[model samples]
Target: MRSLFSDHGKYVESFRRFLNHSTEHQCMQEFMDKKLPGIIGRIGDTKSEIKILSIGGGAGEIDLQILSKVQAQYPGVCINNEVVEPSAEQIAKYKELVAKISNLENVKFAWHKETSSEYQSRMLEKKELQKWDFIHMIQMLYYVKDIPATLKFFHSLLGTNAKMLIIVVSGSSGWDKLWKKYGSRFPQDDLCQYITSDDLTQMLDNLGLKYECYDLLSTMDISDCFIDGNENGDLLWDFLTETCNFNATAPPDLRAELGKDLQEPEFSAKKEGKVLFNNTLSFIVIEA
Candidate 1:
């Protein structure tokens, strides 16, 4: 199947906007606050040198907070930040954002404008196995063609006593519910696959890997919206119309109606400043 991201590059600006919003900022902050302390604790008294690899790090702005927290808590720690992203535009954006941060001086930010699979191949070429102290894969698993193989490859990169973190939308997240309701309207190849925490845990256990799981609850408000003619509905409608295959499957007349519903006042009247769509982010931290 063609990669969902292959044609999604043109929509990067929209994604950037969504990710930079206040709600997402809080989500990432909570993630860093909750997870980083544990990771730091595990690295106790190891030389001040930390090698961190962020796979599928698009735009790389999120890591700024993480790096800042690390520098604040652990002074004099050398950070080698290797960011792997396939989009050149995203790579440029990441560079621009990182350049604006003064605290990143001690950080060596290397960008690989390639997919995670390609980066893994390069790692194998150099015979550099099990060298990373911290490896993070966030919100990028769905784009991977083979989740199990990809997880195994990352598992191999863990140094003794190192940790690998994988963050994914929980099975009960709003996205999953939406997909379940409307996925049939989209192309089969473009549909997303979500793994529940229980299933993922079993997969890891079957592979003889011990790990820790944490659930972070996050919510987004968009109540004043409508599906086609409803008020304040553009938030969800826009996502469906642009990101999903709704337009492709809908009849022209229905598509027009759907768009109209998204702008309707009745929908707007129902809008609450907070729409209460909750997301469960599961973090699986494994010791290598």
Candidate 2:
């Protein structure tokens, strides 16, 4: 009842709905087009095999985008990609994507059907210190048990001149505002920690790690949420709250209050009869 982590299918369905209504994917594509090449260019030696690790690469959409950039930047160089994802459904989708792509002849993919912590534990038990030229955790840190420890462990895995990219909601986003006020009221779960890049940056500073940050502005149209009995809106509400059947199960009073809150300036803005929720994301790049 606490989170979508409990129901993967519902979570996936809700996420699909959220993606269709939000500018999240477009913003990510734009940000990568502008910045990823430079980051990829800076990492890995041109003459050596490039090792890339993707933690929680759901469905492999963004992972392929990243691989394309790496291939273009370092053409004909052999690449080893390690994908660590928890859901079998997602991993199956990732493999399906890999099978359809004809140009990945030079790239070797190794799949791990495990969470990041599980993968890390297994590696540690094997006394293996496999270094990576590029490591990315896009919107995955929230699921980790210990954010600071996770950061340190991943940072330790970076090879010389390597880069690690972390993307998450920014502190200034509507999500932060909503969670700050009502996070405790929602059914809580360990994995769905409602944190932002501001919290992460503070941890990095305390850990004495140097990194660069960028903001990716985005908006989600939640106009339908105001209309009762809208299916997509209910799905979106479930996704945003990370709780299944949020619209059906939440108290009537709380639901009405949240409906009002979503339209407030702190959460969303109205333009041309559409309510746009702030969906700003932050990019943090750590170099080794």
Candidate 3:
């Protein structure tokens, strides 16, 4: 199976379908609305400048939403935000969004068109520690080559009274179950690891790091996925399996087996003629 990262256009298309079918954004927004104020309140004392490092800040929409929380906590405080993202297209869109914001008078943005690893190595090469008050890696760790090393590197950069946020699929979600069963059927890529919060928790335990975990309930309607020759369903399949043209390219026997498994009670629930896949998310917070 071809990794979804191989094609950015398809990734974006499938991602759109995933978003439309799922309650991911709404669940995350709810998480932020209820928990973010207290989270921001716990950050370093009100300072003149709040430095933030947002890794894999795709399109910058989510980053802006998070910034709004920070802005509310530290009104009129200058912000220096560094966004690390590899796609230039996303950076362009990010800049476009930033330009239209009327209340960004105190926020300074720096765009880095580099992957997390590249940014990490470059920063390490500079031989100077640049600390951040708040750092967030939202749904981007699956693409990184080394999760433990990445977490360690970022954790080391946290200043006093700071925190780092990491979000991924929950252990109890259908993603974890699906990957546990058929992950081996799909080819693995160094850049893509089918990991969930359970794996991360084990890794953190091994690394002797402490973090607070929050679960955000979410679901995705995959009713179209069972249909034959459905474009959106195929895209959703591609995103879910993190493969290119999975429905078309998977071995018939494996496809047949996995297709049935996708609708099994363990993976999804039938509601209103829709197969609602368990698209639950986990948010982990590490403080300094």
Candidate 4:
């Protein structure tokens, strides 16, 4: 996972760019507009203050969007925003973005520059259990070494009637098929596992965390910008092809030829109409 993170920074950047753009921005807007109301409703008679924690919130983009809505709906509420991100680069980007948001004045941001396991250990040491009203772990579970243990830690951090939302790539997503099909070209254990909605929901139920699941209706099309050779394109291309040991497994000559082939504009043009890069996100609201 570290290897993927280290080598696929550009790919992450590309995806981030898409999220920042209007196409993906609308998807995010729809998510917040639809989901936040439910969360607020679930809060019921809690105090005017809400402490929201986003575990593994890379760059804090989604946090900013969610916080804005929460503040708008519940004015005069104080928000304690805690973000757990281990990447220094991502942390810096998060800080920069936060600084630009004027409405984030009430946000108290804390950076836990450590893995989820490390953060859980520290929380236990500090005796800070069941401290958060809402916890969100978005598209980050794959990076964690132990998904069940991580879910348990989040469960422990929830206040009474609190909720934890977990989002992962859908099992049926094109991204899943691509990796599963070509992953054998990569070294063993190089690919991350995509969790099915059913499996995830069952896991939550087994742990006594009552939850709900939602299917993202929209599709994210990024084939327009991913090409080889171009710096930004290469970043994403490398991420798709190399970061997960795809390049490592190939002979040097084959790797070079494949890299060149992936760069051809025709590939993107051909797939642009047919492939839908929709991310399957699941929402789990837990009550203690």
The per-model lDDT (C-alpha) reads 0.64, 0.88, 0.88, 0.63
lDDT of 1 at 41: 63
On a 0 to 100 scale, what is the lDDT of residue 63 in model 3? Answer: 88
The TM-score-based order of candidates, best leading, equals 2, 3, 1, 4
RMSD of each: 4.9, 1.5, 1.5, 4.9
For each candidate, what TM-score against the reference? 0.79, 0.95, 0.95, 0.76
In model 4, the worst 10-residue window by lDDT is 261-270
Residue 214 accuracy (lDDT) in model 2 = 96
Ranking by lDDT: 2, 3, 1, 4
lDDT of 4 by residue, 85-157 (tens): 8878888888898888766666688888888888888878875455777788877776777777788878887
Residue-level lDDT of model 3, residues 174-262, one tens digit each, is 99999898888787887678889999999988988889999987999998888889989799989888889987788889878878888
The CA lDDT at 202 in model 4 is: 69
The count of residue-pair clashes in candidate 4 stands at 1
Backbone clashes under 3 angstroms, per model:
19, 0, 0, 1
The regions of model 4 sitting more than 4 angstroms off are 1-4, 8-25, 128-130, 188-198, 218-236, 242-274
Runs with alpha carbons beyond 4 Å of true place in candidate 3: 44-46
**Per-residue lDDT over 146-199 for candidate 1, one digit per residue giving the tens place of the 0 to 100 score:** 777787888887766678878776665655655554455444554355455665
